[PDB]
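Morning!

As promised:
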Amino acid sequence: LGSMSIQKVHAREILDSRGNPTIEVEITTGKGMFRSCVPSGASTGVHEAVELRDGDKKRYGGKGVLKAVENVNTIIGPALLGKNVLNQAELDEMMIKLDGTNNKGKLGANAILGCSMSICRAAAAEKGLPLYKYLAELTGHKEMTMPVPCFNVINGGAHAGNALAMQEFMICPTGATNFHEALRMAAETYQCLKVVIKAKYGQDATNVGDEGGFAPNVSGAREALDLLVEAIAKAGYTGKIEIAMDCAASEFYNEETKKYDLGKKIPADKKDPSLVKDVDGLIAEYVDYGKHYPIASIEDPFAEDDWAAWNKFTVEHGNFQIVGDDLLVTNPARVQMAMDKNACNSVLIKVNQIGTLTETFKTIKMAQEKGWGVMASHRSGETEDTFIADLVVGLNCKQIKTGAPCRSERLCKYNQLMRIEEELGNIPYAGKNWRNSTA
Amino acid sequence: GSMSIQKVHAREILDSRGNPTIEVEITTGKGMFRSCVPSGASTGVHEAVELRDGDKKRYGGKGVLKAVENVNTIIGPALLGKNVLNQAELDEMMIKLDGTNNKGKLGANAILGCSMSICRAAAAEKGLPLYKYLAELTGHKEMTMPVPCFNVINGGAHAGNALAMQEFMICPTGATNFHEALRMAAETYQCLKVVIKAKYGQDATNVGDEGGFAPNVSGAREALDLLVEAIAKAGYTGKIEIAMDCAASEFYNEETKKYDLGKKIPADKKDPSLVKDVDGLIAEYVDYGKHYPIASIEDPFAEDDWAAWNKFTVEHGNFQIVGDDLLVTNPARVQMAMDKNACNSVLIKVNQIGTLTETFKTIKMAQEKGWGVMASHRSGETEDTFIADLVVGLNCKQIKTGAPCRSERLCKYNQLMRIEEELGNIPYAGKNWRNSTA
Ligand SMILES: O=C(O)[C@@H](CO)OP(=O)(O)O
Ligand SMILES: O=C(O)[C@@H](CO)OP(=O)(O)O
Ligand SMILES: [Mg+2]
Ligand SMILES: [Mg+2]
């Protein structure tokens, strides 16, 4: 019983970037108090660990987290008092067993994750290390790299009234030489995009979505991609910025007919029937985009359980980074399935989707051992917490998507990444290297 | 000793709009204290000016590498070894080091970052939370949780709609504590979002710089109707009031002395009565007030239309009339308003003056006159929560720091909740906005 021992655990309800309640957890040791805030997704894969919400329709539209907070204060916290914060896997497993359900739906994945993260922060202080460095040592990473940031810039799918099927288009400065330059390139390109959008779609078209990007009324993906090429060109960075696409294809998939409708939002009398695609037709569409635009990466190109489609795309078009999101939900068992089936070559990491840091590390290890890409990710409902910045560096993931360069729940991560780079001095930048290893 | 400045270091970060700003770290025996500075003006006639690089090829000329260099190589060395507890002495030292009235040599941004981090280091030296240290420093024996006022609808230069005014805010003056105030506003905002989607479409729920919506309304009445509807849907009629920021300088014609409430309306669709003289404008404001629960009006007239401000304040002595552009957090402008009886409330934007010491003085002047005092965000904010501790410790009783949306806004509201939780019994301002010396 010493400085490393938990003396106090306390949670409270705060508001996330969308203005909905979420939880923050504070853990106190001899090194001080350590705070973590938990994010939350606007739309969530059917397989995620589950956040506990109050369901009281008279309070915050039923989205309160008083129950999760009490769970921390009167259940998890009491069980953590006196324990050693250095024992990350032991404490995470203890909370998993308290809950007793595979989806963490009893105590709430949000309650558990908040404790998991603050335990980790307290431990880094105990070792006298910055968080990213503690994360590296905890996970056996002898090398660290600044990740390529991918910035949401144009929205579609369920997030916009435009005709655009895909959920988002991102810009990724793979050609930058360091992180502060990468951020500057994206910020400049984002401002050029804002100008182009204002001129073409009007002032109000530059108001922003949840993640800081724009939702102009484009006719489809080609018009959206043209806008990105135009902005990158105005910024002067052609050939140094690439494009990532998140299709979120489950959103426009018809399980019964096996069809993907790229015109779901288009009025019948204006709807090209060619927009309703079978897998081969959807594949050809993606390949066409790839031929005409610098698209490096495609996330959720097919529905969350269309394994055959994922496999075909992966072995027949492996030149793309192919990212499982809704497919994998940061869940090691899903990752194992995807590896056996050879269904993708990259995984998105959303910590709150699995609910503990220990399980997150395992997901990342599996991916890195296979040489898959690993992209740390924000949620639509973010907070002023910067944890994932340290996580992406410490675990050497090499990619992060955490928002447009707009809205501070996004900038706070990018600012932290710049600090980490400044502090390290001679840390390399990932550039066009996305595939991971366990080194 | 642990009070002595051992290290001063600044770097360039991005603000909530994606533009560069500065953050400053000061290290003492108590640890490292970081402050982020919100973005402000680099030009203008009365306010302190931030320093920008003006390199067109970098961040569109908006870099702050020069301000950063000023902190690291000029202000920092002048601070080394100094006692953080001496706020006024250090602020005055920096003011003299810059040597210009508007801090334009070193930059108000460079100076303020230092001022704030000195203050945080001092609070730690005294073993106090920031808000409490601030109260002690400024002689406030009583603290109050402020009424938060939240941006909800945008007009003027911030929207393509016909709405003349820059923004409407909602203010939960009928809440009983701060946690409840925030919830009321969050619920109302979500209700408004639903209403706007139904009436104007999904894309009309995308948000502006401060988290509010820009629905294509025809004018003030349509906007006010949406707010009253949202408030009723949330179930808080009579407990939420409306603040109107006209930013009237935006639609003032200096040659004709007219205020055009239809600047954005095409000539052939335009009601001719929309172009008003001062009396006509006053009449319009009075009419909104008769039909809607409007509790305050910010910049109702142009930034130098003293006669109009005085006329309005005299004819409505009891009603909150807030100076923003009129005053720019500037003690000399505040004094002029007091001499002319031009208004009865002041916005406080710390970066518009540049040091905490001068900020304390502007607030003190207003409190001695029984004026309203409203701590305010900037359009380009950061993840820094300083103004939350500031508004509580200085007993200002009002704060406007965004819609309940975008974390550069929520981080302040979240911090305000923490302060209330920590204090326990602290009163909520409610309908009491006029400050006092108590
Ligand atoms: O959908 C996504 O990929 C991400 C944000 O880019 O998260 P979310 O689930 O919360 O929307
Ligand atoms: O326009 C304004 O009146 C205010 C509102 O926050 O500030 P700024 O200059 O930051 O825009
Ligand atoms: Mg996705
Ligand atoms: Mg204003």
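Residues B 166, 245, 247, 298-299, 324 surround magnesium ion (ligand 4) (CB under 6 Å).

Hope this helps with the figure draft.
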